[PDB]
Design a protein around this motif. Structure first.
Motif, short mmCIF file in Angstrom:
data_model
loop_
_atom_site.label_atom_id
_atom_site.label_comp_id
_atom_site.label_asym_id
_atom_site.label_seq_id
_atom_site.Cartn_x
_atom_site.Cartn_y
_atom_site.Cartn_z
N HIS A 2 0.84 -1.20 0.00
CA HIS A 2 0.00 0.00 0.00
C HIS A 2 0.87 1.25 0.00
CE1 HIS A 2 -3.56 2.48 0.66
NE2 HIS A 2 -3.03 2.99 1.76
N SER A 3 1.94 1.25 0.81
CA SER A 3 2.81 2.42 0.87
C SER A 3 3.61 2.59 -0.41
CB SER A 3 3.73 2.32 2.08
OG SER A 3 3.18 3.00 3.19
N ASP A 4 4.11 1.48 -0.99
CA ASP A 4 4.89 1.60 -2.22
C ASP A 4 4.08 2.28 -3.31
OD1 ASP A 4 7.29 0.62 -1.30
OD2 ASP A 4 7.36 -1.12 -2.63
N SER A 60 4.45 -3.62 -8.35
CA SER A 60 5.53 -3.07 -7.54
C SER A 60 5.77 -1.62 -7.95
CB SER A 60 6.84 -3.87 -7.68
OG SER A 60 7.28 -3.92 -9.03
N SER A 61 6.43 -0.87 -7.06
CA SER A 61 6.83 0.48 -7.42
C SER A 61 7.90 0.48 -8.51
CB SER A 61 7.33 1.24 -6.19
OG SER A 61 8.69 0.93 -5.92
N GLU A 62 8.63 -0.62 -8.67
CA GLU A 62 9.63 -0.70 -9.73
C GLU A 62 8.98 -0.63 -11.11
OE1 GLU A 62 10.12 -2.66 -6.80
OE2 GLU A 62 11.54 -1.05 -6.32
N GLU A 63 7.86 -1.32 -11.29
CA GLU A 63 7.13 -1.27 -12.55
C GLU A 63 6.70 0.15 -12.87
OE1 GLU A 63 4.08 -4.22 -12.76
OE2 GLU A 63 5.63 -5.77 -12.48
N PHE A 64 6.15 0.85 -11.88
CA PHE A 64 5.78 2.25 -12.05
C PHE A 64 7.00 3.06 -12.47
CE2 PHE A 64 3.37 6.06 -11.29
CZ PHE A 64 4.30 6.98 -10.82
N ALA A 65 8.12 2.86 -11.79
CA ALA A 65 9.30 3.63 -12.12
C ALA A 65 9.78 3.32 -13.53
CB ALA A 65 10.40 3.37 -11.09
N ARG A 94 14.52 15.25 -14.30
CA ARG A 94 15.24 15.58 -13.09
C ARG A 94 14.30 15.67 -11.89
NH1 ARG A 94 18.35 18.68 -16.75
NH2 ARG A 94 16.93 20.44 -16.38
N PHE A 95 13.09 16.20 -12.10
CA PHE A 95 12.10 16.19 -11.04
C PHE A 95 11.80 14.77 -10.59
CE2 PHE A 95 7.75 15.89 -9.58
CZ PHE A 95 7.67 16.89 -8.64
N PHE A 96 11.61 13.85 -11.53
CA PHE A 96 11.20 12.51 -11.15
C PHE A 96 12.30 11.78 -10.40
CE2 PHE A 96 11.45 7.97 -11.88
CZ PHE A 96 10.30 7.57 -11.23
N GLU A 97 13.53 11.84 -10.90
CA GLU A 97 14.61 11.11 -10.25
C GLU A 97 14.83 11.62 -8.84
OE1 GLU A 97 17.24 10.23 -14.39
OE2 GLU A 97 18.22 11.12 -12.64
N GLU A 102 14.21 10.76 -3.02
CA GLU A 102 13.94 11.37 -1.71
C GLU A 102 13.12 10.39 -0.87
OE1 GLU A 102 12.72 15.03 -0.55
OE2 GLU A 102 12.01 13.94 1.20
N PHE A 103 12.47 9.41 -1.49
CA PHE A 103 11.65 8.42 -0.75
C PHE A 103 12.33 7.06 -0.53
CE2 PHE A 103 7.48 6.11 -0.28
CZ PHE A 103 6.97 6.89 0.73
N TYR A 104 13.04 6.55 -1.53
CA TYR A 104 13.69 5.25 -1.49
C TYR A 104 15.20 5.42 -1.34
CZ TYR A 104 9.14 3.89 -3.40
OH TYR A 104 7.79 3.71 -3.60
#
Ligand SMILES: CCc1c(-c2csc(N=C(N)N)n2)[nH]c(C)c1C(C)=O
Ligand SMILES: [Mg+2]
Length: 104
Positions: A2-4, A60-65, A94-97, A102-104
């Motif tokens: 849920h948090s990811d 997973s958050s990896e797929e989103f990334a 640059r915003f996204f990276e 800042e979270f992971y």
């Protein structure tokens, strides 16, 4: 998690609303962009991630990334770094990276 994926919402909303987001809100129209179909094998854009994310289509958050990174890879593949879409993509990338680290 849920948090990811609660975090993938935050950042996608922040990209969806960023001043530099205009090249990426909608899929590129290949009818209007000569060469785009030929060069870009796997198109991606924010509305498409938004659809997939609402749908639960990310596990997973990896797929989103991966989908986010693909927006900017395809951007730098197709547009010159000094083009207007290119300059906008460097800001969005640059915003996204930075927001992602800042979270992971
Ligand atoms: C240059 C077209 C393009 C847009 C786009 C969105 S809206 C617009 N046109 C005006 N603002 N006139 N171009 N987005 C991306 C990712 C593009 C490419 C080929 O990479
Ligand atoms: Mg990369």
């Amino acid at each position: 998690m849920h948090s990811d994926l609660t975090f993938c919402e935050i950042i996608l909303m922040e990209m969806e609303s960023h001043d530099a987001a205009w090249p990426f809100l909608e899929p590129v129209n290949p009818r209007l962009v000569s060469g785009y179909r030929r060069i870009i094998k796997n198109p991606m854009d924010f509305s498409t991630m938004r659809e997939r994310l609402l749908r639960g289509g990310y596990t997973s958050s990896e797929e989103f990334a991966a989908d986010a990174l693909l927006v900017f890879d395809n951007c730098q593949t197709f547009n010159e770094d000094d083009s207007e879409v290119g300059k906008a993509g460097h800001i969005m990338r640059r915003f996204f990276e930075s927001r992602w680290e800042e979270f992971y």
